[PDB]
Amino acid sequence: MGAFRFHQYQVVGRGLPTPTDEHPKIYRMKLWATNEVRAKSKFWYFLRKLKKVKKSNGQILAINEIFEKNPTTIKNYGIWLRYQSRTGYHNMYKEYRDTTLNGAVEQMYTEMASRHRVRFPCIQIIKTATVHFKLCKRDNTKQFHKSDIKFPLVYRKVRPPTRKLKT
RNA sequence: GGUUGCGGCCAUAUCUACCAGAAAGCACCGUUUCCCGUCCGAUCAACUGUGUUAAGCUGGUAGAGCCUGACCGAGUAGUGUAUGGGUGACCAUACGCGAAACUCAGGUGCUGCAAUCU
C-alpha cells in the first residue's frame, strides 16, 4: 500500500551469548511495525515482556517484511489488545471489521484513543487472528458486513450517498 | 584406606541414632610416692603399662542449619537515563540494569606439609 499503517515484520533471532553449555533458544515475535526502527524496539520490549533478556543477549538474525497475501478484502480482524488508561494496561479482545492489517492498526489506534483512553506511550497488542465471515461476534459494524457478503445485502447497505440524487 | 603433627579456606566442617585409626604405627588406666594442682589427683604435674575399643581424635552412615546452582516467581519489586499521561498525589515510556519466596540439586567439609603406616 501507500504510506504504511504497520506492516508486520517477522523478526527473528538468537541469543548468542556466553561460554556456557546454555544459549537461549530459538524465537519469534512477529510484530507490527513501520520498518527497522520499530523492529528493533519491539524486539527489546518483547524481550522485556515474556522472555527477560538484555539488549545484548537478544541477537537479531534476519528480517522479512509484509505486503498483502490473501486479498485486500475482507478479514474483519479479531485483535487481542491491551490499552493503558488511568493506571496500567487492561485486557481486550476486539473484533472489528477491517480491510486489512494495514488499516487494523489505525482502526484500533482510533478505538484505544477515542474510546478507551490512549495517548502516547503505548504499544500495541498481542495477536491478530483471522476468522470466517459468518463467525464474527461483537458486533455492530461487522454484522452488517457479514450480511453484505451474504448478499441481498450488499443491495442493502448500498445506502450511503443516497439522499443526494433524485432518480 | 589413609590415623596423626603444623596449618589455610574458615556456615559446603551446628546439633542428634550407630559401624571404624588398634597383637607390638591411640585413647584410656595405673604411680597419682613425687617436681606439680589444690579445696579433693579432680585440675594439673610428674613416672609408667593389666590390657580395652566404651567413649577420644578422626574415618563409616541419617535430618532442621547453611553456601552454591537449576526451576518457576520468570525480569517480577526496585533502579540511574531521556519523556508522555493524571485533578492532585500519582503513573507509564524507551535506554541500561535487576532482589524476595518455589521446588529440585550438589556438600554432614575442603585443601597443603609432614609423624608417614598395618
Coordinates of all heavy atoms in Angstrom, one line a residue, chain B residues 59-70:
Chain B
rG59 P 36.4 -37.1 59.4 OP1 36.4 -36.1 58.3 OP2 35.3 -37.0 60.4 O5' 36.4 -38.5 58.7 C5' 37.3 -39.0 57.7 C4' 37.5 -40.5 57.8 O4' 37.9 -40.9 59.1 C3' 36.3 -41.4 57.6 O3' 35.9 -41.5 56.2 C2' 36.7 -42.7 58.3 O2' 37.7 -43.3 57.5 C1' 37.2 -42.1 59.5 N9 36.2 -41.8 60.5 C8 36.0 -40.6 61.1 N7 35.0 -40.6 62.0 C5 34.5 -41.9 61.9 C6 33.4 -42.5 62.6 O6 32.6 -42.0 63.4 N1 33.3 -43.9 62.2 C2 34.0 -44.5 61.3 N2 33.7 -45.7 61.0 N3 35.0 -43.9 60.6 C4 35.2 -42.7 61.0
rG60 P 34.4 -41.0 55.8 OP1 34.3 -41.0 54.4 OP2 34.0 -39.8 56.6 O5' 33.6 -42.3 56.5 C5' 33.6 -43.5 55.7 C4' 32.6 -44.5 56.2 O4' 32.9 -44.9 57.6 C3' 31.1 -44.3 56.3 O3' 30.6 -44.5 55.0 C2' 30.7 -45.4 57.2 O2' 30.7 -46.6 56.6 C1' 31.7 -45.2 58.0 N9 31.3 -44.3 59.1 C8 31.8 -43.0 59.3 N7 31.2 -42.4 60.3 C5 30.2 -43.3 60.8 C6 29.3 -43.3 61.8 O6 29.1 -42.3 62.6 N1 28.5 -44.4 61.9 C2 28.7 -45.5 61.1 N2 27.8 -46.5 61.4 N3 29.6 -45.6 60.2 C4 30.3 -44.5 60.1
rU61 P 29.9 -43.4 54.2 OP1 29.8 -44.2 52.9 OP2 30.7 -42.2 54.2 O5' 28.6 -43.2 55.0 C5' 27.3 -43.7 54.5 C4' 26.3 -44.0 55.6 O4' 26.9 -44.3 56.8 C3' 25.2 -42.9 56.0 O3' 24.2 -42.8 55.0 C2' 24.8 -43.5 57.3 O2' 23.9 -44.7 57.1 C1' 26.2 -44.0 58.0 N1 26.5 -42.8 58.7 C2 25.9 -42.5 59.9 O2 25.0 -43.3 60.4 N3 26.3 -41.4 60.6 C4 27.2 -40.5 60.2 O4 27.4 -39.5 60.8 C5 27.8 -40.8 58.9 C6 27.5 -41.9 58.2
rA62 P 23.9 -41.4 54.3 OP1 23.4 -41.7 52.9 OP2 25.1 -40.6 54.4 O5' 22.8 -40.9 55.2 C5' 21.4 -40.9 54.9 C4' 20.5 -40.8 56.1 O4' 21.1 -41.3 57.3 C3' 20.0 -39.4 56.5 O3' 18.9 -38.9 55.7 C2' 19.6 -39.5 57.9 O2' 18.4 -40.2 58.1 C1' 20.8 -40.5 58.5 N9 21.9 -39.7 59.0 C8 23.1 -39.4 58.4 N7 23.8 -38.6 59.2 C5 23.1 -38.4 60.3 C6 23.4 -37.7 61.5 N6 24.5 -37.1 61.8 N1 22.4 -37.7 62.5 C2 21.3 -38.4 62.3 N3 20.9 -39.1 61.2 C4 21.9 -39.0 60.3
rG63 P 18.9 -37.5 55.0 OP1 18.5 -37.7 53.6 OP2 20.1 -36.7 55.3 O5' 17.7 -37.0 55.8 C5' 17.1 -35.7 55.7 C4' 16.5 -35.3 57.1 O4' 17.3 -35.9 58.2 C3' 16.7 -33.8 57.4 O3' 15.6 -33.0 56.9 C2' 16.7 -33.8 58.9 O2' 15.4 -34.0 59.5 C1' 17.6 -34.9 59.2 N9 19.0 -34.5 59.3 C8 20.0 -34.7 58.4 N7 21.1 -34.3 58.7 C5 20.9 -33.7 60.0 C6 21.7 -33.1 60.9 O6 23.0 -32.8 60.8 N1 21.1 -32.7 62.1 C2 19.8 -32.9 62.3 N2 19.3 -32.4 63.4 N3 18.9 -33.5 61.5 C4 19.6 -33.9 60.4
rA64 P 15.8 -31.6 56.3 OP1 14.8 -31.2 55.4 OP2 17.2 -31.4 55.9 O5' 15.6 -30.8 57.7 C5' 14.5 -29.8 57.9 C4' 14.8 -29.0 59.1 O4' 15.5 -29.8 60.2 C3' 15.8 -27.8 58.9 O3' 15.1 -26.7 58.4 C2' 16.3 -27.6 60.4 O2' 15.3 -27.0 61.2 C1' 16.5 -29.0 60.9 N9 17.8 -29.4 60.5 C8 18.1 -30.3 59.5 N7 19.4 -30.5 59.4 C5 20.0 -29.6 60.3 C6 21.3 -29.4 60.7 N6 22.4 -30.0 60.2 N1 21.5 -28.5 61.7 C2 20.4 -27.9 62.2 N3 19.1 -28.1 62.0 C4 19.0 -29.0 61.0
rG65 P 16.0 -25.5 57.7 OP1 15.2 -24.2 57.8 OP2 16.4 -26.0 56.4 O5' 17.3 -25.4 58.6 C5' 17.4 -24.5 59.7 C4' 18.9 -24.2 60.0 O4' 19.7 -25.4 60.3 C3' 19.7 -23.6 58.8 O3' 19.3 -22.2 58.7 C2' 21.1 -23.9 59.2 O2' 21.6 -22.9 60.2 C1' 21.1 -25.2 59.8 N9 21.5 -26.3 58.9 C8 20.7 -27.3 58.4 N7 21.3 -28.1 57.6 C5 22.6 -27.6 57.6 C6 23.7 -28.1 56.9 O6 23.8 -29.1 56.1 N1 24.8 -27.3 57.1 C2 24.9 -26.2 57.9 N2 26.0 -25.6 58.0 N3 23.8 -25.8 58.6 C4 22.7 -26.5 58.4
rC66 P 18.9 -21.6 57.3 OP1 18.4 -20.2 57.5 OP2 17.9 -22.6 56.7 O5' 20.3 -21.7 56.5 C5' 21.3 -20.7 56.9 C4' 22.7 -21.2 56.4 O4' 22.9 -22.5 56.8 C3' 22.8 -21.2 54.9 O3' 23.1 -19.8 54.5 C2' 24.0 -22.2 54.8 O2' 25.2 -21.6 55.1 C1' 23.7 -23.3 55.8 N1 23.0 -24.5 55.3 C2 23.7 -25.3 54.5 O2 24.9 -25.1 54.3 N3 23.0 -26.4 54.0 C4 21.7 -26.6 54.2 N4 21.1 -27.7 53.7 C5 21.0 -25.7 55.1 C6 21.7 -24.7 55.6
rC67 P 22.7 -19.3 53.1 OP1 22.4 -17.9 53.2 OP2 21.6 -20.1 52.5 O5' 24.0 -19.5 52.1 C5' 25.2 -18.8 52.3 C4' 26.3 -19.5 51.6 O4' 26.4 -20.9 52.1 C3' 26.1 -19.7 50.0 O3' 26.6 -18.6 49.3 C2' 27.0 -20.9 49.8 O2' 28.4 -20.6 49.9 C1' 26.6 -21.9 50.9 N1 25.5 -22.8 50.8 C2 25.6 -23.8 50.0 O2 26.7 -24.1 49.4 N3 24.5 -24.7 49.8 C4 23.3 -24.4 50.5 N4 22.3 -25.3 50.3 C5 23.2 -23.3 51.3 C6 24.3 -22.5 51.5
rU68 P 25.8 -18.1 48.1 OP1 26.4 -16.8 47.6 OP2 24.3 -18.1 48.4 O5' 26.1 -19.2 47.0 C5' 27.4 -19.6 46.5 C4' 27.3 -20.8 45.6 O4' 27.2 -22.1 46.3 C3' 26.1 -20.8 44.7 O3' 26.2 -19.9 43.6 C2' 26.0 -22.3 44.3 O2' 27.1 -22.6 43.4 C1' 26.2 -22.9 45.6 N1 25.0 -23.0 46.3 C2 24.1 -24.0 45.9 O2 24.4 -24.8 45.0 N3 22.9 -24.0 46.6 C4 22.5 -23.2 47.6 O4 21.4 -23.3 48.1 C5 23.4 -22.1 47.9 C6 24.6 -22.1 47.3
rG69 P 24.9 -19.2 43.1 OP1 25.3 -18.0 42.3 OP2 24.0 -18.9 44.2 O5' 24.3 -20.2 42.1 C5' 25.0 -20.6 40.9 C4' 24.5 -22.0 40.5 O4' 24.5 -22.9 41.6 C3' 23.1 -22.1 39.9 O3' 23.2 -21.8 38.6 C2' 22.8 -23.6 40.2 O2' 23.5 -24.4 39.3 C1' 23.4 -23.7 41.5 N9 22.4 -23.5 42.5 C8 22.4 -22.5 43.5 N7 21.4 -22.6 44.3 C5 20.7 -23.7 43.8 C6 19.4 -24.3 44.3 O6 18.7 -23.9 45.2 N1 19.1 -25.4 43.6 C2 19.8 -25.9 42.5 N2 19.2 -27.0 42.0 N3 20.9 -25.4 42.1 C4 21.3 -24.3 42.8
rA70 P 22.2 -21.2 37.5 OP1 22.9 -21.1 36.2 OP2 21.6 -20.0 38.1 O5' 21.1 -22.4 37.5 C5' 20.9 -23.0 36.2 C4' 19.9 -24.2 36.3 O4' 20.0 -24.9 37.6 C3' 18.5 -23.7 36.4 O3' 18.1 -23.4 35.1 C2' 17.8 -24.8 37.1 O2' 17.6 -25.9 36.3 C1' 18.7 -25.2 38.2 N9 18.4 -24.4 39.4 C8 19.2 -23.4 40.0 N7 18.7 -22.9 41.1 C5 17.6 -23.6 41.3 C6 16.6 -23.6 42.3 N6 16.7 -22.8 43.3 N1 15.6 -24.4 42.2 C2 15.5 -25.3 41.2 N3 16.4 -25.4 40.2 C4 17.4 -24.6 40.3

